[PDB]
Design a protein around this ligand. Structure first.
Ligand SMILES: O=C(O)[C@@H]1CCN(c2ccccc2Cl)C1
Ligand SMILES: *[C@@H]1O[C@H](CO)[C@@H](O)[C@H](O)[C@H]1NC(C)=O
Length: 359
């Protein structure tokens, strides 16, 4: 019922503080499907901001206090009631302890205070899983939420490339990016980037890469070239360069997107200027998903979905996300009868979809 913690056998692949990184696993030996979920949790891009993150968010920077077990929820659940999609698959939960949107490849030294090895954590987890059943897998679905969702876009092709070089061409590597599809848009009200809540999404990534030694997919890197690798952290720019099949899940009005845009929707009156900004945001995000054939984008103000216990409740055009993911599976065995995979809401205001989460 639960996933057991495994600290990485290679203790040089560590978390921010140098403690070994790891993964939670529940095997399903009657299944050739493997789900590797990347946890989210924002980031930190300088010594001062990472020090504050270590003081009150230490679990996102260290494994010394990790529990020995975790319960799988949502798409990580083994119960068909909670997970009609992949309830029988092998479940892997990879905790987010690198604070680098899973892009780093820099080890701790006498020069660097923290280690940013998120990209190396993923590859090492995949390497150690091969000796536990992944060698015989048919499909490896790399999933993630929020920063883990962007981590999927940054790493899905690297995992496919790694499994090919290691000699496992039969494993089909796929991606599921949840709430990691962001826009480098203008803020509603300007804020000087000093932390994250008071920072724009474009400037946050520009200084994060330089501090993390972050890496991006190769074809995207060769488009934007030196100094502009931050562009590959934004889904609508990096997705067209990806080779692996990627399903994109994204609220049209993601709370984290509204946060970095300095939008605070409480219960106050919404003036004309804010209404226009919010409606334009949903339009822009809907436009970036036009040519994403496998997508699920409800017009809701929310954050993350795929590991929430009630991720089965939201519907777009009458189709739930677990069904859309099943249709996506069938399409990878052209459109199917009664099994759609492109589900993007068209109404322009938060909760115009009646199935949006309520609380
Ligand atoms: O982790 C979260 O939910 C934050 C939301 C915004 N962030 C983000 C993540 C990847 C690329 C660009 C950005 Cl701006 C992190
Ligand atoms: C352990 O990880 C380090 C850092 O990525 C790497 O250099 C080393 O080759 C790894 N060890 C093995 C046996 O793969």
């Amino acid at each position: 019922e639960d996933l057991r913690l495994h600290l990485l056998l290679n203790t040089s692949v560590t978390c921010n503080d140098g403690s070994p990184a790891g993964y939670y696993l529940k095997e399903s030996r009657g299944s050739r499907r493997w789900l590797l979920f990347l946890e989210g949790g924002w980031y930190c891009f300088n010594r001062e901001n990472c020090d504050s993150r270590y003081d009150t968010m230490r679990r996102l920077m260290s494994s010394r206090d990790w529990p020995r077990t975790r319960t799988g929820t949502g798409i990580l659940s083994s119960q068909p009631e909670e997970n009609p999609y992949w309830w029988n698959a092998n479940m892997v939960f990879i905790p987010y302890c690198s604070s680098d949107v899973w892009s780093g490849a820099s080890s701790k030294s006498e020069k660097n205070e923290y280690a940013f090895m998120g990209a190396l954590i993923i590859q090492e987890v995949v390497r150690e899983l091969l000796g536990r059943g992944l060698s015989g897998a048919k499909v490896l679905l790399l999933a993630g939420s929020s920063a883990g969702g962007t981590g999927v876009l940054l790493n899905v092709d690297r995992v496919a490339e790694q499994l090919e070089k290691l000699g496992y061409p039969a494993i089909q590597v796929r991606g599921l990016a949840d709430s990691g599809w962001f826009l480098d848009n203008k803020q509603y009200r300007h804020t000087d980037c000093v932390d994250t809540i008071t920072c724009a999404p474009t400037e946050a990534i520009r200084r994060g890469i330089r501090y993390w030694n972050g890496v991006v997919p190769e074809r995207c890197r060769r488009q934007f070239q030196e100094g502009e690798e931050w562009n590959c952290f934004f889904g609508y720019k990096v997705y067209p360069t990806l080779r692996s099949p990627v399903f994109v899940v994204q609220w049209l009005f993601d709370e984290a997107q509204l946060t970095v845009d300095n939008v605070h929707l409480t219960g106050q009156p919404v003036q004309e200027g804010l209404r226009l900004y919010i409606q334009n945001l949903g339009r822009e995000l809907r436009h970036t998903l036009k040519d994403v054939p496998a997508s699920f984008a409800p017009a809701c103000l929310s954050h993350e979905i795929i590991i929430r216990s009630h991720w089965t409740d939201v519907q777009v055009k009458g189709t739930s996300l677990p069904r859309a993911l099943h249709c996506w599976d069938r399409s990878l065995h052209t459109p199917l009868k009664g099994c759609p995979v492109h589900l993007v809401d068209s109404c322009p205001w938060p909760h115009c979809n009646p199935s949006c989460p309520t609380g």
